[PDB]
Amino acid sequence: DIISVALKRHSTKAFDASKKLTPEQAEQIKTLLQYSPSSQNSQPWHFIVASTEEGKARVAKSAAGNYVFSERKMLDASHVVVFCAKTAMDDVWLKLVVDQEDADGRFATPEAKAANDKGRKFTADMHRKDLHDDAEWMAKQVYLNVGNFLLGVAALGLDAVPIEGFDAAILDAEFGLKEKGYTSLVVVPVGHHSVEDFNATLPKSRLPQNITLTEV
Amino acid sequence: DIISVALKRHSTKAFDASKKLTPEQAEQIKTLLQYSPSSQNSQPWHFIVASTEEGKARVAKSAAGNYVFSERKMLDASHVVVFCAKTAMDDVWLKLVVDQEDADGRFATPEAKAANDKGRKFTADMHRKDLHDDAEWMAKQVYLNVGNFLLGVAALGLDAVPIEGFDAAILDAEFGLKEKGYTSLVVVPVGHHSVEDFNATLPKSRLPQNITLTEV
Ligand SMILES: Cc1cc2nc3c(=O)[nH]c(=O)nc-3n(C[C@H](O)[C@H](O)[C@H](O)COP(=O)(O)O)c2cc1C
Ligand SMILES: Cc1cc2nc3c(=O)[nH]c(=O)nc-3n(C[C@H](O)[C@H](O)[C@H](O)COP(=O)(O)O)c2cc1C
């Protein structure tokens, strides 16, 4: 029951480092990252999946200064996903996407492929050339991916925590992201919570719908 | 299982106007909106859930003329959700959130409540004063909610499509959002697809993980 999943999931504050994802689960989480929807299927993202001691430690360099409380979550979880956005939308990426759709069998005719490409270029250009908000627009798609991911990992019976509390400059530098064309946005440790996870037992809290939700 | 859901769900291109959500389903989609996570539990959002014909017509006004194909989808779906972000994170809202957390029993002591409020204020202030990205930060939380929602509604057996193809200035004006401190970001019609939904039977397409995903 997905509503049950949504109501029971929580942000894990402490992970049991001994409780790893199964091999299948580790593939499932990668599938969830890949299959998120995004505007124009633009998929403007890269993921770093850290599963080794060394790899997790590299990500954990970002939990410095104001962000030290994030460090243990990054080290102790089984798998840690760094969600990254492209820093600019380029035509090469646009072509990549449409060619992949063609390879996958989405276009019956050259005309259909060309109309798809034109539409995607129009939208991408509106953001980059006119609104000058392509970096934000791409970042929004990445956050959508995060939302899909958190629900999906809960539905697999896995714990996770989304983290904005990290130093993206440190994380980008550690992985050479800027030169590759990406920037780190959200870190999501995934695994199984320990008995020290005080948030596992605390009540969920949300604003009432009478504040947030209008029916018409 | 949730991976089946992720692999089978799609953006619906055409809705069967006769197929309405059940009352239970209409409550469930509200539950999904409310229970999404967000940075600091800041919940910087408002939802407009249009289920009457008049209501849906008000939302569909935003697509008139320039977003014709969008317009039809918003009219035909059972329930149409407008995802809105706050335009500023005011201290009233910060207090609302922490007081709600208190009401729900998340704090053992006044000290714990005060530390929570201080933390949230610090984050909000960093975005507003230093990063100059508070509107974007809130908008990102709203996109995360959308991601959660799309997977959740698919897992309920419902069809949907996320839509950026609408005129947010028009939608904002129609509902007086600017003065209320909100702006429209994404519209999500929800219901059941019709036989005209050509996308229901097309293969999904995503870039290969060898492009988008690095393991370490
Ligand atoms: C984008 C995002 C960033 C977050 N950053 C952090 C963080 O740095 N550290 C942390 O412990 N919790 C973090 N949280 C967890 C939130 O506090 C949490 O989602 C919210 O209080 C709702 O509780 P729940 O996730 O248990 O439903 C983050 C949440 C989101 C969605
Ligand atoms: C934020 C967002 C905005 C979108 N806007 C539109 C839109 O205005 N019209 C439309 O037909 N599809 C829209 N799409 C659907 C995407 O094209 C679709 O998600 C993508 O091609 C992946 O296909 P799937 O959703 O079937 O998995 C949007 C998707 C997202 C995530």
Author numbering:
A (entry chain A), B (entry chain B): 2 to 217
What does the paper say about this structure?
The most active mutant selected was T41Q/N71S/F124T. While the N71S is the only mutation at position 71 that enhances the activity of the protein for CB1954, the F124T mutation is not the most active mutation at position 124, and the T41Q mutation by itself reduces the activity of the protein for CB1954. The mutations together, therefore, show synergistic effects. In the triple mutant, the N71S mutation is the same as in the double mutant; position 41, however, is now a Gln, which is larger than the wild-type threonine and more polar than the leucine of the double mutant, while F124 has been replaced by threonine. In the structures of the free and nicotinate-bound triple mutant, the Q41 side chain forms a hydrogen bond to the T124 hydroxyl group, pulling the residue slightly closer than in the wild-type protein. In the structure without nicotinate, there is an acetate group in the active site, and Q41 forms a hydrogen bond to the carboxyl group of acetate so that this ligand is in a slightly different orientation than in the structure of the wild-type protein bound to acetate, determined previously, where the hydrogen bond cannot occur. The crystal structure of the T41Q/N71S/F124T mutant shows a hydrogen bond between Q41 and T124, explaining the co-operativity between these two residues. On replacing N71 with S71, in most of the structures of all the mutants, a water-mediated hydrogen bond to the FMN cofactor is found from the Oγ of S71 instead of the direct hydrogen bond from the NH2 of N71. In the triple mutant, two smaller bridges form between M127 and Y68 and between N67 and F123.
